Amino acid sequence: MVMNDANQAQITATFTKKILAHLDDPDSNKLAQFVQLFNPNNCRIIFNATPFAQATVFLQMWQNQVVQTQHALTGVDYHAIPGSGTLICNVNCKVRFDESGRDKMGQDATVPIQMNKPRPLWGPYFGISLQLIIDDRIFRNDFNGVISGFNYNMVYKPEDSLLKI
């Protein structure tokens, strides 16, 4: 039963644009929500070719020692494996980091020995190629423990960026 209908394809496009939004929020209290999508029992992240055993610990990483990010989708395609009940999607996107000089919490590097928050200054574009494994219940409008695979990797980088990869 190779299911292939345009109605299912639309859901994939918006879902991929939805997961990126959570990764882009510099908020901290809301972060507990993004955990629910990840599978608590068994899950296998990969971020720039280093394994993460737990999904929860990888999210405290994204908020503590990683600067603000701002992704930008360019290509998505998927394939539903018959019998499996799961589908695999190929995602490509760009990445910008805030090179102003402070992290998410808002602490600068200058040591204190003594208008609102400045707008962040963004840097050059990067390159991402993301593969992820999802089950088919996402078509049924439920988002609890639906993410089973997440391979976030980067393919190229510019030399002008202050980030060292």
Partner: protein
């Protein structure tokens, strides 16, 4: 030549090898220059020669005691030493900022600076300008103004990119054996690979049309995806759903229908092989594995069937559409292109068969795992 050779000679004397420092102060005091007899124009000269010497590496520069009042004279510094890291222009009489604004966000690697006895030091705003001009500065006027590492904890993630990854040696090495078998047959003979494809197997082609930034080394600024845009299955690019139902190919006959549309390739894999970062990861519920590969290939040949001649422009006389006379992305030439390929294979007692095949083609660019 001999005439320019003296200017090369003076740089050798005024560069100290072991300390890796180039002391440039008091240029006119060079004794070897006096036998010639000696303006305000030689400053850009050296800088050009320093880049082309190719034998001395500089990362620190002393330029104090040169009698300057404006910085336009040395503005070519940023064009020769982007990774300079220790500038001393102290003992000078500069008093305004319009001539120093030329280094906005430049000299990022620079992290030490001595500007003692300059009139600028007395200002209260003195702190602010640098703080944006040199984001990675740490020490200024021999006083710490930034907390070193605290800095290098923002501007660098806490690990290093790995070019290969796999759970076990047996699984990882076997995938490379599959990849070598798969790719070498890919270039030579399209016919044989059908036996690895199931009637349930599905294949699709995805094309990314973004232009890589010019700062990327060996970036391709004139991509040409002409043959792939009639078969590209991109969800966010094309909104004609009807077409997407036709882009997908299922079955033995459908897969080989596409296989002749794509041009002949030839990868420099097991030869040039630092380039082809690949990760493989298990697929528990179906007892399979996923192989994700990133690399590049060379379009050495053209497709046998155009797919736009037997049915395309069936009406004679009038040509096709946007006059491929350089128009469009720009054509349909034959040239190097990068690619990201992911695999889904279910092992069997007899032989493995491919479940799904995704191919993503983009403009050629260098890898990030380089060194």
């Amino acid at each position: 030549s001999d005439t320019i050779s003296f200017l090369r000679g003076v740089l050798l004397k005024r560069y100290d090898p072991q300390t890796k420092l180039l002391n440039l102060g008091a240029l006119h005091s060079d004794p070897e220059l006096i036998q010639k007899g000696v303006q305000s124009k030689m400053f850009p000269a050296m800088m050009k020669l320093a880049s082309t010497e190719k034998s001395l590496i500089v990362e620190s520069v002393n330029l104090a005691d040169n009698q300057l009042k404006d910085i336009s004279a040395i503005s070519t510094l940023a064009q020769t030493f982007p990774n300079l890291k220790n500038l001393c222009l102290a003992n000078n009489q500069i008093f305004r900022f319009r001539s120093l604004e030329v280094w906005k966000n430049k000299f990022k690697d620079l992290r030490e600076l001595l500007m003692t006895n300059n009139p600028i030091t007395t200002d209260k705003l003195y702190r602010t300008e640098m703080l944006r001009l040199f984001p990675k500065l740490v020490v200024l006027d021999n006083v710490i103004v930034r907390d070193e590492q605290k800095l290098q904890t923002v501007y660098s993630l806490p690990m290093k990119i790995q070019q290969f990854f796999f759970e076990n040696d047996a699984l990882g090495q076997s995938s490379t054996d599959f990849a070598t078998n798969f790719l070498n047959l890919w270039d030579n003979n399209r016919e044989q690979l059908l036996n690895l494809y199931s009637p349930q197997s599905q294949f699709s082609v995805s094309v990314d049309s973004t232009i890589p930034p010019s700062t990327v080394t060996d970036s391709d600024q004139t991509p040409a995806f002409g043959y792939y845009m009639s078969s590209s299955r991109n969800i966010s690019k094309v909104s004609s759903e009807k077409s997407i139902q036709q882009r997908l190919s299922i079955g033995q006959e459908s897969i080989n229908s596409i296989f002749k549309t794509l041009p002949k390739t030839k990868h420099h894999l097991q030869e040039q092989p630092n380039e082809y970062s690949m990760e493989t990861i298990s697929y528990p519920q179906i007892n399979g594995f996923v192989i994700t590969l990133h690399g590049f290939f060379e379009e050495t040949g053209k497709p046998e069937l155009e797919s736009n001649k037997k049915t395309g422009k069936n009406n004679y006389q009038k040509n096709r559409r946007y006059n491929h006379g350089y128009n469009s992305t720009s054509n349909n030439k034959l040239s190097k292109k990068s690619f990201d390929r992911t695999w889904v294979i279910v092992p069997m007692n007899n032989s493995v068969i491919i479940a799904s095949d995704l191919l993503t083609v983009r403009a050629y660019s260098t890898g990030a795992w380089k060194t």
